[PDB]
Design a protein around this ligand. Structure first.
Ligand SMILES: NC(=O)C1=CN([C@@H]2O[C@H](COP(=O)(O)OP(=O)(O)OC[C@H]3O[C@@H](n4cnc5c(N)ncnc54)[C@H](O)[C@@H]3O)[C@@H](O)[C@H]2O)C=CC1
Ligand SMILES: NC(=O)C1=CN([C@@H]2O[C@H](COP(=O)(O)OP(=O)(O)OC[C@H]3O[C@@H](n4cnc5c(N)ncnc54)[C@H](O)[C@@H]3O)[C@@H](O)[C@H]2O)C=CC1
Ligand SMILES: NC(=O)C1=CN([C@@H]2O[C@H](COP(=O)(O)OP(=O)(O)OC[C@H]3O[C@@H](n4cnc5c(N)ncnc54)[C@H](O)[C@@H]3O)[C@@H](O)[C@H]2O)C=CC1
Ligand SMILES: O=P(O)(O)OC[C@@H](O)[C@@H](O)[C@H](O)CCO
Ligand SMILES: O=P(O)(O)OC[C@@H](O)[C@@H](O)[C@H](O)CCO
Ligand SMILES: O=P(O)(O)OC[C@@H](O)[C@@H](O)[C@H](O)CCO
Ligand SMILES: [N+]
Ligand SMILES: [N+]
Ligand SMILES: [N+]
Lengths: 525, 524, 524
C-alpha cells in the first residue's frame, strides 16, 4: 500500500472528510482591432470536500454486458481479484490492468534531495475504488453467459478463458430492451433476451414507460442482492442511430418523460437506460457515439442532480491522432490533410458496417480537427486557407477478429513549399484498450461522486453551502471521443490537456499547485 | 498583435519590466513503507526584462554553407522581401511554417462565453523577428550561398532562381579544419581554412591564432554591419567527442592554456565556443559532440555569457518522445522501440563515419530511461524494468535531404495482449531544422534581455539582479542532448519542455501557469 | 490425386520412367554496332526417374533443438497424427501452409472450355510426404524437443500441450562445438558436445574422431530405425566464414588431411558435411557460412552425393527480389532500396555478433546487381548504373520469433517523378522457415531418384546415365546465396527459380514448358 502525505495548512481532516482550500486563477480576454489582447486575471476561491470513505464494493451495471468489452471487463476484474495466472506461448503471465490510466500511470509529486523528479501512482494521492472491488452485472439483448461471451469475442488467451470458465459461465446478462429501428438490421438474431415482449410473438416498442419502470427495479434488485450502496451504469452496447432532437418530444424534462410514456419513436433504448439511472440517482456513462443525452434528458439529470458523461469511448487510435495533430500544430506545422482508415472483424465493426451507426462514429470526430484549427489563426485564416481535409473509413473485415488495424495519414505544409508526410499504423485487439478505459471511467466517476465544493468569499469570512459537480462530468473528457458539454462551452479535445486537468485536480485536493515545469532550482540559483 | 495584462505584479520602469513571481514546487521523501511525504516550497523572485530589442540581430553560423545554413539565409531573405514563387501547385507565398516562435499560438485565457482565446506566441513580450537577422558565418567550403542552395537541393528550383542575385553575394568566411575531428571524407570539401602553415597546408599548430582570428571575424562583422548584438550557432558537421581530462580541459585556465599549447583535445568546436564567450557573444551548439567540456562552462560563467546545446532536436525524435510518453501516461508498457532511418545529404554522409554517428547515439537515449524511470508501476524488478531500443541511420544518397524515418513500438497490453504501433515519417529535414534554428536564435536573444533576483518575505534587498545560469536549459525543447548543471537530470519530454516556455513567458507578464481545470464550466 | 500424360516421350520400364526431352536454348554475341546475333542450340537428353520412393525418409537436423528444428518435428507429428488444437479462434486442423511442395498447385493445361486446370504440385511424380519423415539430429544443447518448443515460443500453447508426450521423448544427439566459430554468447548453451578432451573440456583437438563419431551417428540412426534413405540438413546457428586456402581446404585431399591435422579452418559445418558425403547422405546447408569450400565440393562429386545451399531464403528476402523485379520489368528504375529488420530469437541473438551477421550480408546482394545487370536501358554510364541498398538486422528480444521486416524502395519515374514503395512484414519467421525446410528435403529426395544422359541425333549410345551435378541449383528458390559451379552466375529471381521446377517436373512427364500464349483464345 502506497500513499502520500502533503504537509500543508490548506487541508484539514474531519470525520473522514478532507476539506481543502484552493484558489482558482484564470483570466478573461478581449481583443483590440489593432490586435491588442486585453487580459484581466480572475480569481475564485473555493473550499473542496472529499468524502474519504470509499464504498467497499462498487456495483457496475453494463448495457452490452455480453459484448467484447463487457465480457473482457468481467474477465479482467475476476482475473486480477483472484490472481489467475494463465499460460501463453511466452509463458505463464500474471494478470494486470495495463492500459488503465487510474491503475497503471504515475504522476509527478515533486522533486527529491537532488533536483530529481519523484513520481507516484495516480491512484495513490487520494482514495480510489479499486477495480478488484467491482461487482458487475448488466443487461444484453442476448442470453449468452459470459463464458460463451468470452468464447465468441475471441479477445483473451485460450488458457485464460479455460481458467475463468467455471466462474464466467455463471454470469448471465439480464434481459434488455431491443428496439429494432435503432441499430444495424443485422443484430436481429442475437436479440433473444428482451423484456419488451408483447402477448407472444414478442418484440414491440409499445410500453416504453413500463420498460423504464423495469430498468429502475433492475437497478434496485441488483443493489440489495449484493448488499451494495453505490452503483454506476455504463453503456457499451452496439452504436445506435442518432435520434432527431425536436421541440416537444425530448427538448425538455417534461417533454421527454412524456414522449416516453407516449412511446415516441425518438425515445431510444439508451434514452430509457439513461432516464432510469438518473431517476434512481445512479451515474450513467455513454460509451457509444449516438446522442443519447438530448436536452430533455440533460435537464432531468440537472433536476435530479446526477452524474452523466460520455459520447463514445475514446479510442487509442483517435486519441493518438489528437496527440499527433496538436504536437504538429504547436510546432507551427500545418496539417492540410488527415486520412483515417480502419478495419476490424468483431460485432462492433459488423454493426458499424451500416451507414446509420457509422454516421454516429463519423459525427464524433466532426469537431476535433476543428478545435486544433481554431487555436492557430497564424496557420489557419482566410488568407492561407483554413481547412484541413479529412476522412474516416471503417470497414468490416471478419478474418481479423477483434483486431483493429488502424492507419492514418498526415500530409502537412512545411516552410517554403516543402511538405511532410507522416503515417501511423496501429494494430491491436481493440477491446483490450477499451476495457482499461472503461475501468478508468467507472473508477473516476465514483471518485467524483464523493467530491463536493463551496465558493468562498474573501470579505465575508465564510459563505456558500457544499454542492456537487455540474451533472455533466467533462472531467472524463480524456476518455470520450465526443466530450459532451454545457450549452455555452465549446468541446476541448486535447488529449494531454484533459489529463493535465485531472492531475491538477487531484493535486489541488491534497494542497499542491498546478505543475509548472519551470524547474528554477536548476535553471537559476 | 500585442498583449496587455492588468496585474500589480508588473511595473514598467525606464524601458525595463519588473515582474514579481512566486515559485511553488515541492520536496518529497519516500518511507520504504510506501508513503511519500510532501513538503511544498516557495521562492519569490523578481525578473527584469530589458524591453529594448536590437532592431537588427546578427547571426553568425559555423557551417554557413550547408543545407541548414543555406536554407536559413534563404528563408530570412524570402520572407523579409516577400519573395513569392512558382510551383506545380501555383504561386506560393513564403512563411516560417515549422517555427514555434513565428507560427504557433498560446492560450491567454477565456473570453466571455468561456471559450479559449489564443495569441501569437511571439506577441506577449517583444521578440526579434528573423526578418531582421543579418547573417554571416564560416564554412570550410567557399562556395557562395547561391551554389550552396544548389548543392543542397532543398529548395524549390524557381525560388532558388528568384534568390539567386541576392544569395550569390553571400560567401562563407574561412574556418577552422582539424581533419582528424570529422569524417575523413570531408577532406576534399575543405577549400576555405584559416589554419594554414607557412607553406600553404592546413595545420593544427597555432590554435590560439585561430582562436584570435575568430574573435577578429566576430568584431569585424559587428563593426562592418554596425550591430551590437550578435549570436553564434554551430550547424556544421558533427565532430567526434573529445575526451574530458584533468588539467587540459577541466577548467577555464587549463583549457585556455591547452588551446595555447595546441593540445589534441581542442576541437574546432571548442575554439569557436571559446572565441564567442571571450566576446560575450552567446554560443548555441547545434550538433552532438561534447563542445561544452567543464573548462568551457566556467569561462561562460565568468564572462557572464550564454551557451546552450548538444544536437538539434531532430524532430523525428520529437514525435518519438511524445508518442512514447503518451503510452506511458495511458498505463501502456512499451517493451521495445526500434528506430530506423536514412537520408542522402552531407549530414548523412558525414554521419556514415561511426565516430560522428556515435555522437547522435548518446546525445539521444536518456529519454527511454526517464520515461521508464517515472513509472515503476510498469517498470520494476518483478515485471522487468527495461525497454529494448536501437538507433540506426544509414546514408542512402538517392533520397537527398529527404530523411525517411521509421519507428516501431511493440507494447504490452492487459491480460497477454500486445499493441504494435509504427510511425513512418518522410520530409526534407532541413526544412525542419531551419525553423528550429530560427526558434532558437529568437529565444536565445530574448533570454538575453532577462535577468532575475531571488527575493525574501520580510528581509529582501541589497538588490542585484543576476543573469540566467550560463546553460540555457529553457532551449531543451529544440536540442536532443539538453546540456545541464551537474547531478541534475536531463529530462526531455518535449510537451513539458514546451509548458516551461509558455509558463515563463506567462509569468513575465504576471499570468499564473495554465491548469486546465475549467471551473467556470465544471463547477456550477 | 494423380497425373497421367499420353506422350511417347515416356516409357515405364521396370519401376523406372525413361523420358526423352529436347533442350532448346541460344547463344548470343553482341556486335558493338548494337546487334545481337542469336544462334539457337539443342541438346537431347534422357532422364531416368526411379519411381520407388523410400516409404520412410530419415531427416537428420544439425540444430535439432531450435526454433526451426523444433517446429519441423512438431509439424511432422501434428500433421501425421492429425492433432487438432485449441485457439482463441476455435479448433484448428494442422496443415503444411507455406510449403510449396505440399500446398501450392501447377497449371497442367486447359479443359474443354479453355479454362486453366491446376493440380497439386506434388501430384505429378511421386514424392515423399513430410508425414513420413523420421527425425533425429544433433544440438549443442540437450534439451528435449518439448522443452525446445517451450523455449522457442513459436507454437500455440495448447498445441504445445497436445504434443508434449510425444515431443518430450525426442532428444538431440550431442554435437561438435568449436566456440570460436560462433557468437561467444552461445557458450553457456553448449551442454551436449562430443568433442571433449580427456579432462572433460570441449576441445578442438581430435577433429577426425569427431568426423567419425558423426558417421557412426548417421549409421546407427539408419540401423536403429531400419531406413536406407537419410538426408542431413544444417539449421544450426550461422558460423562465420572460414578462409579458403591452398593446400588446406582447396581439394578433397587437402581438406581430408586438414581435418586429420586439426586445422583452424575446419568448422563444425565442414565436419558434418564431410561425414555426410562419406556416407552418401545428401547434405543441405541451410545457413550463410561458406561450408562448401572447393575441397568439399570435390568429395561430393567423387562420391556421387548431393550438396545444396547457403542460407534459407529468408522469405522477406523473397518478396523483395520479386518486388524489385516487377519494377525493373515495368521500365521502373529503383535507385535505392533500404532493408531493415529485427526479431528476438536465438537466431537474432547469434547474428547480433557482426562476424555471423557478415554471412547474411553477402549470402544476400548478388540480386540487386543481377536486376541492374539485366537492364542497361535503365542502368548504364550515362544515367548511372547503381542502386544504393543496405541490410540491417538488430536483435530486439521482446518480439520473440517475430521478425519485423521493413523495406523501402525509392524509384525514378518519367520526367522527374518518383515513386516510394514500402513493404512492412510481420510473421514468426520459423513458421516460414519450417515449410521451406520440408520443401527442400522433399525436393532433395526427388532429385535423388533422377538421373540423365546426354543423347545424340544419329549416333547416341554407349548408354550410361549420370547423376545431377553434386550442386543442386534446382533448390535456389529456397536458399539466399545459391551455390553454383565456377564462373557461372548465381541468378536469383524467385519466380524464374520457380518456373524451373515446374518445367522440370513437367518435362519428366513429357509436357513442354508453359508459354502463356493462349492461342485457342487469342487466335480465331
Ligand atoms: N469492441 C471493442 O473492442 C471497442 C468498442 N468500443 C464501443 O463500445 C460499444 C460496443 O463495443 P463492443 O463491446 O465491442 O461491441 P459488441 O457489439 O461486441 O457488444 C455490444 C453488446 O451490446 C448488446 N446490445 C446491443 N443492443 C443492446 C441493447 N438495447 N441492450 C443491451 N445490450 C445491447 C449486443 O448484444 C452485444 O452483446 C460500441 O458501441 C463502441 O462505442 C470502442 C472501442 C473499442
Ligand atoms: N541537414 C539537415 O537538414 C539537419 C541537420 N541537423 C544537424 O545539424 C548539423 C549540420 O547539418 P547540415 O546543414 O545538414 O549538414 P551539411 O553537411 O549540409 O552542413 C555542414 C557545413 O559544415 C561545414 N563544415 C564542417 N566542418 C566545418 C568547420 N570546422 N568549420 C566550418 N564549417 C564546417 C561543411 O562544409 C558544410 O558545408 C548536423 O551535424 C546535425 O547536427 C539535424 C537534423 C536535420
Ligand atoms: N528461426 C527462424 O525462424 C529462421 C531461421 N533461419 C536460418 O536457419 C538458422 C537456424 O536458426 P533457428 O532455428 O532460428 O535458430 P536457433 O538459434 O533457434 O537454433 C540453432 C540450434 O543450433 C544449435 N547449434 C548451434 N551450434 C551448433 C552446433 N555446432 N551443433 C549443433 N547444434 C548447434 C543451437 O543450440 C540451437 O539450439 C539460422 O542460422 C538462419 O540460417 C532464417 C530465417 C528464419
Ligand atoms: O464498432 P465498435 O465496436 O463500436 O468500435 C469502433 C472503432 O472503429 C474504434 O477504433 C473508434 O471508436 C472509431 C474510429 O477509429
Ligand atoms: O545529417 P545530419 O545533418 O548530420 O542530421 C542527423 C539526423 O538525421 C538526426 O536525426 C540524428 O542523427 C538521429 C537522432 O534522431
Ligand atoms: O535469426 P536467424 O535464425 O539466424 O535468421 C536470420 C534472418 O532473419 C535472415 O532474414 C537474414 O539474417 C537477412 C536476409 O534476409
Ligand atoms: N472494436
Ligand atoms: N538531415
Ligand atoms: N528468425
Amino acid at each position: 500500500i502506497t500513499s502520500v502525505k502533503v504537509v500543508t495548512d490548506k487541508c484539514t481532516y474531519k470525520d473522514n472528510e478532507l476539506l481543502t482550500k484552493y484558489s482558482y486563477e484564470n483570466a478573461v480576454v478581449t481583443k483590440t482591432a489593432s490586435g491588442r489582447f486585453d487580459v484581466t486575471p480572475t480569481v475564485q476561491d473555493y473550499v473542496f470536500k472529499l468524502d474519504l470513505k470509499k464504498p467497499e464494493k462498487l456495483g457496475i451495471m453494463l448495457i452490452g454486458l455480453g459484448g467484447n468489452n463487457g465480457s473482457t471487463l468481467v474477465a479482467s476484474v475476476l482475473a486480477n481479484k483472484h490472481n489467475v495466472e494463465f499460460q501463453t506461448k511466452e509463458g505463464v503471465k500474471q494478470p494486470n490492468y495495463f492500459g488503465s490510466m487510474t491503475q497503471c500511470s504515475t504522476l509527478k509529486l515533486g522533486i527529491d534531495a537532488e533536483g530529481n523528479d519523484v513520481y507516484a501512482p495516480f491512484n495513490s494521492l487520494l482514495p480510489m475504488v479499486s477495480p478488484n472491488d467491482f461487482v458487475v452485472s448488466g443487461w444484453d439483448i442476448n442470453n449468452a453467459d459470459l463464458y460463451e461471451a468470452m468464447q465468441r469475442s475471441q479477445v483473451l488467451e485460450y488458457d485464460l478463458q479455460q481458467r475463468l470458465k467455471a466462474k464466467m459461465s455463471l454470469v448471465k446478462p439480464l434481459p434488455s430492451i431491443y428496439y429494432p429501428d435503432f441499430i444495424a438490421a443485422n443484430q436481429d438474431e442475437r436479440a433473444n433476451n428482451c423484456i419488451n415482449l408483447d402477448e407472444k410473438g414478442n418484440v414491440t416498442t409499445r410500453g416504453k414507460w413500463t420498460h423504464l419502470q423495469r430498468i429502475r427495479r433492475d437497478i434496485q434488485n441488483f443493489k440489495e442482492e449484493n448488499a451494495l450502496d453505490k452503483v454506476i451504469v455504463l453503456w457499451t452496447a452496439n452504436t445506435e442511430r442518432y435520434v432527431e432532437v425536436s421541440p416537444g418530444v425530448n427538448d425538455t424534462m417534461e417533454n421527454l418523460l412524456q414522449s416516453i410514456k407516449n412511446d415516441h419513436e425518438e425515445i431510444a433504448p439508451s434514452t430509457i437506460f439513461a432516464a432510469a439511472s438518473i431517476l434512481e440517482g445512479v451515474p450513467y456513462i455513454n460509451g457509444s457515439p449516438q446522442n443519447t443525452f438530448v436536452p430533455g434528458l440533460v435537464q432531468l439529470a440537472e433536476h435530479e442532480g446526477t452524474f452523466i458523461a460520455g459520447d463514445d469511448l475514446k479510442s487509442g487510435q483517435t486519441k493518438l491522432k489528437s496527440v499527433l495533430a496538436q504536437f504538429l500544430v504547436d510546432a507551427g506545422i500545418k496539417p492540410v490533410s488527415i486520412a483515417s482508415y480502419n478495419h476490424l472483424g468483431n460485432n462492433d465493426g459488423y454493426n458499424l458496417s451500416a451507414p446509420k451507426q457509422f454516421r454516429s462514429k463519423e459525427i464524433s470526430k466532426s469537431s476535433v480537427i476543428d478545435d486544433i484549427i481554431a487555436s492557430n489563426d497564424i496557420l489557419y485564416n482566410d488568407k492561407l486557407g483554413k481547412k484541413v481535409d479529412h476522412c474516416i473509413v471503417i470497414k468490416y473485415m471478419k478474418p481479423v477478429g477483434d483486431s483493429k488495424v488502424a492507419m492514418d495519414e498526415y500530409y502537412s505544409e512545411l516552410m517554403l513549399g516543402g511538405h511532410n508526410r507522416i503515417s501511423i499504423h496501429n494494430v491491436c485487439e481493440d477491446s483490450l484498450l477499451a476495457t482499461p478505459l472503461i475501468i478508468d471511467l467507472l473508477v473516476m466517476t465514483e471518485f467524483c461522486t464523493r467530491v463536493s465544493y463551496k465558493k468562498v468569499d474573501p470579505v465575508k469570512e465564510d459563505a456558500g453551502k457544499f454542492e456537487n459537480f455540474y451533472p455533466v462530468l467533462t472531467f472524463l473528457s480524456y476518455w470520450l471521443k465526443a466530450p459532451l458539454t454545457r450549452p455555452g462551452f465549446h468541446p476541448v479535445n486535447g488529449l494531454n490537456k484533459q489529463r493535465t486537468a485531472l492531475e491538477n485536480f487531484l493535486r489541488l485536493l491534497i494542497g499542491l499547485p498546478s505543475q509548472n515545469e519551470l524547474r528554477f532550482e536548476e535553471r537559476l540559483l
